[PDB]
């Protein structure tokens, strides 16, 4: 601790007085991830193995809530033709707790791959569907030219070429009727320099990339404060209180001492927060319990030592903490070790603070 002052002062000669060096902190001794048992598994493989999807504007969706979803089967690595994801892959999504999940399924063309992206425009992006800028999920694409393609074109799937206005992200228009194409309203049936807005795909197994269909699956993720009953392979991880640990509770990952409190929460209220809008007390997602989040102990380190030419005696002063582990004394400033307490009063030499001073004597 004397050498900590030497590197703090950037010199080998420590002058007589009190000097601040470092900051002590209690590190977490364990990791407690507490979540109840799993209910079912998400159809992660059924959306990829489905026989046929919907069109781009008609896209079908399967809503699966209460994450974590099924992490066992993961096709994110070299399974399909095109894998473009944001954030972390579903391999790392097993540690995240999301409220609702929207699985979108639609088939696009070759030149339409660049048009599918969050916050990006395009022919089918504006006129059919656009991914929202809040999209945290993965965009999966595979080459269906050996299946969905038909001789002479596949007209089952449809796409809207023209529309009176551009669709906002996360908006659905299924209308197949005849509407205004250009700037001149043609009053229904095609004519008067307008065009039939809906169009059929030309999927041909024998043509190039532009005419090749690509099955695209979009997993839309929504994170809220709602509780999550499934996180990772480890569920219970039996609770240990009165210790500094790394906790993950209802999808909230943090480090702090876990202490039981008398705080009364309403049945719909999952967790509280303090004046700083940070996690204060959370409730057990498994059983009925209310647990308080206590920050682990920390504070500043003060070194009380005389001059280098005096002696090597060093008195370490901890700021605002009581030392229960451990010449161990306690003052209003905190734990003070390496010094002796004299009931007599002397002139202040090296101030400790709170009306107490330290000195080097016999």
């Amino acid at each position: 601790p004397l050498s900590e002052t030497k590197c703090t002062l950037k010199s080998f000669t420590v002058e007589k007085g009190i000097y601040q060096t470092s900051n002590f902190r209690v590190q977490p001794t364990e990791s407690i991830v507490r979540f109840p048992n799993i209910t079912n598994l998400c159809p992660f493989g059924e959306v990829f193995n489905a026989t046929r999807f919907a069109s781009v504007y008609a896209w079908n969706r399967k809503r699966i809530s209460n994450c974590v979803a099924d992490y066992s089967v993961l096709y994110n690595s070299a399974s399909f033709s095109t894998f473009k994801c944001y954030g972390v892959s579903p391999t790392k999504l097993n540690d995240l707790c999301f409220t609702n999940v929207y699985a979108d399924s639609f088939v696009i063309r070759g030149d339409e791959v660049r048009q599918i992206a969050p916050g990006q425009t395009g022919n089918i992006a504006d006129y059919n569907y656009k991914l929202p800028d809040d999209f945290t999920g993965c965009v999966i694409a595979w080459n269906s030219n050996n299946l969905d393609s038909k001789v002479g074109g596949n007209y089952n799937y449809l796409y809207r070429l023209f529309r009176k206005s551009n669709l906002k992200p996360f908006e659905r228009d299924i209308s197949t009727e005849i509407y205004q194409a250009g700037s001149t309203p043609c009053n229904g049936v095609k004519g008067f320099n307008c065009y039939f807005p809906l169009q059929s795909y030309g999927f041909q197994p024998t043509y190039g990339v532009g005419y090749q269909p690509y099955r695209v699956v979009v997993l839309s993720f929504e994170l809220l404060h709602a509780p999550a009953t499934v996180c990772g392979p480890k569920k219970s991880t039996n609770l240990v209180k009165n210790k500094c640990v790394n906790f993950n509770f209802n999808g909230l990952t943090g480090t702090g001492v876990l202490t039981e409190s008398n705080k009364k929460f309403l049945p719909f209220q999952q967790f509280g927060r303090d004046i700083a809008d940070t996690t204060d007390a959370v409730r057990d997602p498994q059983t009925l319990e209310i647990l308080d989040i206590t920050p682990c102990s920390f504070g500043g380190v003060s070194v009380i030592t005389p001059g280098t030419n005096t002696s090597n005696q060093v008195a370490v002063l901890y700021q605002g903490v009581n030392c229960t582990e451990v010449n161990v004394f306690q003052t209003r400033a905190g734990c003070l070790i390496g010094a002796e307490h004299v009931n007599n009063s002397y002139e202040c030499d090296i101030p400790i603070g709170a009306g107490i001073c330290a000195s080097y004597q016999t």
Binding site: D274, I275, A276, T278, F298, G300, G320, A333, A354, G355
Partner: peptide
Amino acid sequence: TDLICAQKFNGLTVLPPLLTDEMIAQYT
């Protein structure tokens, strides 16, 4: 004229004064 302990949790440390109020009354 606690807010002290609440702010000490975010890393804001309130240092105790060297001169106590009882010693202030003695100088007075």
